Amino acid sequence: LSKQAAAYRELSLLLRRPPGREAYPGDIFYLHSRLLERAAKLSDAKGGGSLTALPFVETQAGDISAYIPTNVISITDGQIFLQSDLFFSGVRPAINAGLSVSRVGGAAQIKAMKKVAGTLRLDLAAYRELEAFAQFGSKATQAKLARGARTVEVLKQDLHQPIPVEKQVLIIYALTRGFLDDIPVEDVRRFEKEFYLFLDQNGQHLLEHIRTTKDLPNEDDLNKAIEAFKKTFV
Amino acid sequence: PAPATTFSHLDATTNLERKLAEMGIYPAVDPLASTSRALAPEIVGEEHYQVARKVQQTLQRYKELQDIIAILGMDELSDEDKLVVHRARRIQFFLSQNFHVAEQFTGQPGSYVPVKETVRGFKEILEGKYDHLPEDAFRLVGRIEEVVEKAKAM
Amino acid sequence: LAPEIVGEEHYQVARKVQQTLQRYKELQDIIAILGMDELSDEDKLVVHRARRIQFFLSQNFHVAEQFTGQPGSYVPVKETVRGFKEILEGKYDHLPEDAFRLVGRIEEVVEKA
Amino acid sequence: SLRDIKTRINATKKTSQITKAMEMVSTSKLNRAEQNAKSFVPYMEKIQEVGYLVITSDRGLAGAYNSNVLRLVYQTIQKRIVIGRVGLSFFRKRNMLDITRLPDQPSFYMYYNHYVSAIQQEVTERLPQYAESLIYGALLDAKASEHAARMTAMKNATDNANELIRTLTLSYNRARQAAITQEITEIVAGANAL
C-alpha cells in the first residue's frame, strides 16, 4: 500500500501542489484514512456483515520512525512488524512478540485458546528478553531457558502448510502443560506433525467437540491422547 | 530511492559490500542479503536446501559474535561459541574463487568447478574434515581438491 | 510537592516514600537471584516495608463494579497523610501484605485484616 | 555518518547487556565462593591449632587484580612458581611449575590478593599437613578475592555504556533534524525557483 504515496507524490508534484516534509503532501493522513476507516462490523439496522483489512507498508532497513510508517501506525488497531535479522534465525514468517500487540486482542478467540495463552507468555515474554545475555552462564533459571528454547522451536512452521484452529489449540495445550519438553530441540519439528497424524487415528471426538462448542474438552480425557502418544513416540 | 525502486523487479539479486572488497576476499558477494526465487525444494532439491540454509544461518550467527569479540576479548567467550568463529572463518574464506578473466590482476589461469562439487565441498567443510588446515590456504582457490595442494605448497 | 505548598509533614511523608522505595527498586535484581534470608537486617526491613507500600497503592473504584462487585471507596486527603505516616513508621507492619489490596482507607484495611 | 553511530549504538547496547550478565553471574558465584571459603575457615583454624609464589586471574576483564600483584612481587625481588595463564605470560615477556585451569571453587614466600568482600584487594606477603593447610587457605582466599575483583570490574564497566548511548542517541536526533531541515530547505528553494 505504501506505493500509493509514490503515485500520490508524482501527480501531486506534477500538479504543483506545495511540498511537505519529504515531498509528501500533508493529505496523506486524509488519503489513507478515507479508505482505511471503511472496515467495520455493521449493526442489525443496516445489515449483519463484517469486513477486515490487512494494509502493507514498505520500510527502509527497519526505520520505523519514518514518516509513512508512523503515519499508518496511528490508524490501525495494532501492528505486525517483520524483522529481517531474525528472518534468518529460523522463525518464519518473522513476527516478533515484542513490537507487536493487538488492542482488540483477548476477545476474538475460541475459549480453548484463552485458557492457556497466559502461560505461553509467561515463558516467551521472559525468554525473548533474557536469552540475548543470559544464555552463556551454565535450576529454575536454566529450566526457564530450556523451556523458552523449546517454545521458540515449536512455533516454527514449514512452507505453506496451514493448520485448522483445533490442532493449533491442541498443540498449544500440549506445549504449555509441560508434557512436550522431553523431545529434544531438533526433533520438535517432526513431533509437531506426527502428533497431527496420531490424533486422527486416535479419535475425532475431541475434534468434534472443539468444532461444535468452541471450548476445550474434558482435561481428564484430553490428557489421555498425549499420554498414549508419548508411550509410542520414536 | 533509486535502489528501492530497482529492487522490485529482479528475480534474483546479489549484493556487494565494499567491506568485502577491502577484506581481500573476492568476489565481494555478501551471502546474507543475496536471495533468489530458485531456493525452493521443487527446483534445487533437498540436497541443496539443507546445506545452503545451514551455511546461511551459521554466517548470520557469526556476525554478532565477531562484534562482541571486539570488546569482550577472545577467550572470555565459551569454547563452543569460539567454534562458530573457528568454522565460519573457513566457510567465508572458501567462498573466494580464482577467476579466468582476472588473470591480469591475479597473474593466474584459474580453475573450474561444477555445482555438484560446490554442494559436496560445503558438506565436507561442515563435516569437520578440514579443521587443521590454515585459513589463509583457502584464499582464492576453486575446487576443494586444490586446498590440500596449497597446504602441501606451504 | 513543595513544603511551602503542602506543609512540612506532608512533604516529608511524600518524599520519604520515594526515598525508601529506591532501596527495593535497586535490590530487586540481587533478590531475584539469591534468597533474602542471608542478607543484612537493612535489606530485610526494606523488603518488609516495601512489600506493603507496593500493595497499598491499589484501591477499588466505583466503575469496577460491573466486573468486580465492590461498593467503591474514597481516600480523604487529610487522612491520607495520617495513614502513610503511620505505615512508614511501621505501625501496620504486622498485617498480611496482600490484605492491603484494592481499598481506599486504612481503617477498612484493619477491618479486612 | 548516521549509520556509524547507529551501529555503535547497537554494539554498545549488546556489549553492555553482556557485561551486565557477567556481573550477575559473578555476584552469584561470589556469594557461593565466599560461603565455601567461610565453611573452610574452621577446618584451617582447628588444624593450625593442633623461592616465590605468585598467583593471578585466569582470563581477562578482571580489572586491576593482575597488575597490582605481579608488579609488587617483581619489585620486591629485584630490589634485594606461578599459577595462572596471564601469570605465565608476564614471564613470557621479560625473562624469569605452571599449574593452570584448575576448576572454579577448586577442591584440595607467597604473594597474594588477600580477602575482603566489598571493594578493595590487599597485596600481601607471607609438616606436609602444615604446608597443605596454608597453601589451601591462601589459594581459597585468593579465589574469593578474584571473584570480588571481577564483580567490581563488571560494576564499573556497566555504567559508562548508558552515558555513551544517551549522548549518541542525542547526536542521532540532531543528525536527523539537520538532515530533514536541509532537505526541506532545498525542496522549498527549488519550489520557489520553479
Phi-psi region of C54 (alpha: psi -120 to 50; beta: other; left: phi over 0): alpha
* CB atoms near residue A136 (< 10 Å): 14
Cell numbers 543484612 correspond to what residue?
A: C40
CA dihedral B134, B136, B137, B143 (to 10 degrees): 120
**Which residues on C lie below 8 Å from D27 (Cβ)?**
30, 33-34
Which residues, other chains included, contact B25 with Cβ-Cβ below 8 Å and sequence gap of 6+? Answer: B92, B93, B95, B96, B139
Q: Which of A21, A34, A103, A150 is catalytic?
A: A103
Alpha helices in B38-112 (DSSP H): 41-44, 46-72, 79-94, 103-106
Pairing mode of beta strands D110-113, D53-55: parallel
Which residue, D102, D59, D21, is CA-closest to A132?
D21
Cα C68 to Cα C59: distance, rounded to the nearest angstrom? 12
Q: Is D13 in the A-facing interface, judged by CB distances under 8 Å?
A: no
Phi-psi region of D83 (alpha: psi -120 to 50; beta: other; left: phi over 0): beta
Contact A88 B56 (CB under 8 A): yes
Q: Does a cis peptide bond (omega within 30 degrees of 0) precede residue C96?
A: no
D-contacting residues of A 12-31, CB under 8 Å?
18-19, 21-23
DSSP B135: G
Which residue, D116, D134, D114, D133, is CA-closest to D124?
D114
Cell numbers 608488579 correspond to what residue?
A: D71
Amino acid at D152: T
Structural contact between residues A217 and A209, judged by C-beta atoms closer than 8 angstroms: yes
Closest approach of C35 to chain D, Cα-based (Å): 11
Q: Is B76 in the D-facing interface, judged by CB distances under 8 Å?
A: yes
Cell numbers 507524490 correspond to what residue?
A: A9
Structural contact between residues D84 and D65, judged by C-beta atoms closer than 8 angstroms: no
Q: Which grid coordinates belong to C89?
A: 513508621
Cα A199 to Cα D96: distance, rounded to the nearest angstrom? 73
Contact A137 D21 (CB under 8 A): yes
Q: Chain A: residue nearest D194 by CA?
A: A16
D-contacting residues of B 45-74, CB under 8 Å?
64, 67-68, 70-73
Q: Is A49 in the D-facing interface, judged by CB distances under 8 Å?
A: no
Decide if A103 is catalytic. yes
Contact D24 C34 (CB under 8 A): no
Q: Which residues pair with D125 in a beta bridge?
A: D111
Which residue, A119, A123, A128, A122, is CA-closest to A100?
A128
Q: How was this structure determined?
A: cryo-EM
**B/C touch flag: 3 or more CB pairs below 8 Å:** no
**Which residues on A lie below 8 Å from D191 (Cβ)?**
18-19
B37 annotated as a binding-site residue: yes
Binding site listing of A for ATP: 74, 92, 102-103, 157-158
The angstrom resolution of this structure is: 3.7
Backbone angles phi, psi at D4, to 5 degrees: -60, -50
Amino acid at B48: H
Amino acid at D153: A
Structural contact between residues D144 and D37, judged by C-beta atoms closer than 8 angstroms: yes
Q: Does a cis peptide bond (omega within 30 degrees of 0) precede residue D106?
A: no
Mutation site for B-interface testing, chosen from A9, A88, A91, A156 by largest number of B Cβ within 10 Å: A88
Cα D68 to Cα C28: distance, rounded to the nearest angstrom? 34
Q: How many CB pairs under 8 A join A and D?
A: 21
Contact A134 D21 (CB under 8 A): yes
Edge-first strand order for the sheet with D123-125 is: D82-83, D53-55, D110-113, D123-125
Closest approach of D172 to chain A, Cα-based (Å): 12
* CB atoms near residue A76 (< 10 Å): 15
Contact C34 D31 (CB under 8 A): yes
Using CA atoms, how far residue A165 sits from A60, A73, A162, B36, B61, in Å, is 35, 28, 10, 32, 34
Binding site listing of A for ADP: 102-103
